[PDB]
């Protein structure tokens, strides 16, 4: 990051501390929702958030810049408190907020401020509000991967890696507990965002390395880890369609990266280390096909593998979301039957009767080896 941007993020952190942002967010979304999904403050709930600030927080000017960041709500530049006003100008210069053409208002740009798992996080606002296709991913799968981590088991000396870090959320969560975190990605846009989010939570290169590196290169490297997290691209799209960097999995069925990671865990994890993965896995009525491929790791390497299935959908319920996404992502018109192509692909190639949103915990050199699949 440039020095001017670094100073601006430091001043943003100061503002969030002054007005208690994380507590305000936590109160608005409530403890029964805070760790369920990042899609809580959205275009559909913004009016309710504005009403809360107006009627339960008195419309106080100290929260005006905060709402520009949380929902994009415009604030009059002249109504900003003196200290907040200079910071607002710095955020506009950085492209993190917008000014109206006459300079009289400040409002949202393409970054939304949330909190997750105790960290403060800017994300791509287009994922929850209108507009062009988003360029940084975050979702409920991101959250559930972190939910199952046993934080009290993390030592300050444990070497941790978050592959495919995106916004940085998993790496930043790990940094709450260990002093050694590596966060990787290959996309320009997520790499610039995790740089900001690292500084926003008072981490630096001393405790969290940000590295531009393909996961396949990190997997075959000689660095060894005690703890690994990865939410990789895992979605399979029909032949002839392009997705995005964060969505499109490798291999015939979109699971190539999951195979790459799992296959290397006995070599890249120290003995007794643990990995946490998440993916929306296709399967039949019994369960996800991918879990059938993992018995080799139990019998071949003595691993313990636990699969937590937290949501089940029929394949028919994904035809609309997937086909809509493909249409938006490639800028396609509305006269091709993408839904039929998705349906045919699910049936012939994926053999997908259901999609199983699954967090997978894997441990090497297990005292109690085996595969356990948990469904409600």
């Amino acid at each position: 990051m440039t020095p001017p941007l670094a100073t601006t993020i430091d001043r943003l952190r100061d503002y969030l501390d002054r007005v208690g942002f994380q507590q305000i967010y936590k109160y608005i979304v409530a403890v029964n929702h805070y760790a369920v999904t990042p899609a809580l403050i959205t275009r559909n709930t913004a009016a309710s958030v504005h009403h809360f600030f107006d009627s339960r927080l008195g419309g106080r000017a100290e929260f005006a810049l905060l709402q520009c960041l949380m929902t994009g709500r415009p604030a009059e530049h002249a109504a900003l408190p003196d200290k907040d006003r200079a910071l607002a100008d710095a955020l506009v210069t950085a492209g993190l907020l917008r000014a109206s053409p006459d300079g009289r208002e400040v409002s949202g740009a393409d970054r939304q401020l949330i909190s997750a798992f105790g960290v403060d996080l800017l994300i791509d606002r287009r994922i929850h509000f209108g507009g062009e296709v988003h360029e940084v991913y975050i979702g409920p799968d991101s959250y559930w991967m972190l939910y199952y981590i046993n934080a009290s088991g993390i030592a300050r000396t444990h070497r941790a890696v978050d592959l495919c870090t995106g916004s940085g959320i998993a790496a930043l969560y790990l940094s709450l507990f260990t002093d050694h975190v590596l966060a990787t990605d290959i996309g320009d846009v997520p790499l610039a965002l995790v740089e900001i989010n690292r500084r926003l939570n008072r981490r630096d290169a001393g405790t969290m390395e940000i590295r531009r590196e393909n996961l396949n290169d990190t997997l075959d490297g000689r660095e060894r880890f005690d703890l690994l997290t990865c939410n990789p691209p895992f979605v399979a799209f029909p032949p002839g369609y392009s997705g995005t960097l964060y969505s499109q999995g490798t291999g015939v069925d979109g699971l190539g990266y999951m195979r790459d990671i799992v296959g290397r865990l006995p070599e890249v994890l120290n003995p007794g280390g643990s990995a946490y993965l998440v993916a929306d896995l296709c399967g039949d009525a019994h369960g996800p096909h991918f879990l059938g491929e993992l018995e080799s790791m139990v019998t071949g390497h003595g691993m313990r593998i636990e699969a937590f299935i937290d949501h089940v959908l029929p394949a028919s319920a994904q035809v609309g979301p997937i086909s809509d996404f493909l249409r938006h992502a490639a800028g396609l018109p509305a006269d091709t039957d993408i839904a039929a192509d998705v349906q045919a692909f699910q049936r012939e190639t994926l053999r997908a009767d259901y999609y199983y949103l699954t967090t997978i915990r894997l441990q090497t050199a297990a005292q109690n080896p085996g595969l356990r699949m948990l469904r409600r």
Binding site: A39, Y137, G139, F234, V235, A279, A317, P321, L357
Partner: peptide, 10 residues
């Protein structure tokens, strides 16, 4: 529905 489109979003 609710819960759909993971690694996709939006």
């Amino acid at each position: 529905x609710y819960x759909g489109x993971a690694x996709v979003x939006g």
